[PDB]
């Protein structure tokens, strides 16, 4: 195969806190550009998200929000983040709770314990050309278990609108409303499905608490070694449609959709 070619230094055009380069050690496919990279969700037609600041629940903590008196930890069942911003080992990755991070109505500081997803993407990720799966995303560094990796970002749309979108490859159900990353998306639109995934999606609230519109944050379910491809389970709602077209090629010996 070819020497690895750098096809973009940063697909995010400087919108993330580190670059996300795109490389291709496989073929002559250019940097994918059939979409607009956005680092945070957007709308076309109005969604009418409740952003009334008086509707936020918030905490009155006088510490770093690591005590069980933190309202925002109570809304999350407990604050699940350790000192390093990783999910505690007791976090239920099979059936995650809703996470309520602290917000601008809370009395606590911007650096309190209960603020991880709102700080954005930190890990060094790379869009790369796979052999048999199109584009995929890898980590350039070791990512310990329980680490916030990236958010599924895109265009917030209604259920009805999602049903008439010609392309459905980039649809994520909220739980109804959807995120479509087809026209507007971030790096997460390129993550492939894996039957034994190293990422789990968690529903998170931050600047608003409109329960119709959780934000989708991927956390590592295990140590992800430098070089490894990122993968999450796309779910039955996906595979029921896409299965009639093509089979899963994740190569797991515990694969469920080939």
């Amino acid at each position: 195969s070819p020497v690895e070619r750098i096809v973009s230094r940063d697909i995010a055009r400087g919108y993330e806190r580190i670059p996300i380069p795109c490389v291709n050690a496989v073929d002559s496919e250019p940097c994918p550009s059939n979409y607009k990279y956005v680092s945070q969700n957007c709308v076309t037609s109005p969604m009418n998200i409740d952003r009334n600041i008086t509707h936020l629940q918030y905490c009155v903590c006088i510490d770093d929000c690591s005590s069980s008196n933190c309202m925002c930890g109570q809304l999350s069942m407990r604050c699940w983040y350790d000192k390093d911003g990783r999910l505690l080992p007791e976090f239920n990755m099979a059936e995650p709770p809703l996470i309520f991070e602290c917000n601008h109505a809370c009395s606590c500081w911007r650096n309190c314990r209960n603020r991880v997803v709102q700080n954005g993407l930190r890990a060094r990720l790379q869009l790369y050309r796979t052999r048999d799966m199109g584009w995929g995303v890898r980590s350039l560094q070791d990512i310990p278990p329980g680490t916030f990796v990236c958010e599924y970002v895109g265009e917030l749309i209604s259920d009805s609108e999602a049903d008439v979108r010609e392309e459905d490859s980039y649809l994520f159900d909220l739980d109804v409303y959807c995120i479509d990353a087809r026209f507007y998306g971030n790096v997460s639109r390129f993550i492939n499905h894996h039957c034994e995934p190293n990422l789990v999606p968690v529903r998170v609230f931050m600047a608003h608490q409109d329960l119709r519109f959780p934000r989708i944050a991927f956390f590592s379910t295990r140590l992800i070694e430098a070089g490894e491809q990122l993968g999450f389970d796309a779910g039955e709602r996906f595979w029921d449609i896409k299965g009639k077209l093509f089979s899963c090629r994740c190569g797991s010996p515990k694969c469920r959709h080939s």
Partner: peptide, 7 residues
Amino acid sequence: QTARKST
């Protein structure tokens, strides 16, 4: 009748 990913 579109594919949606699921949390």
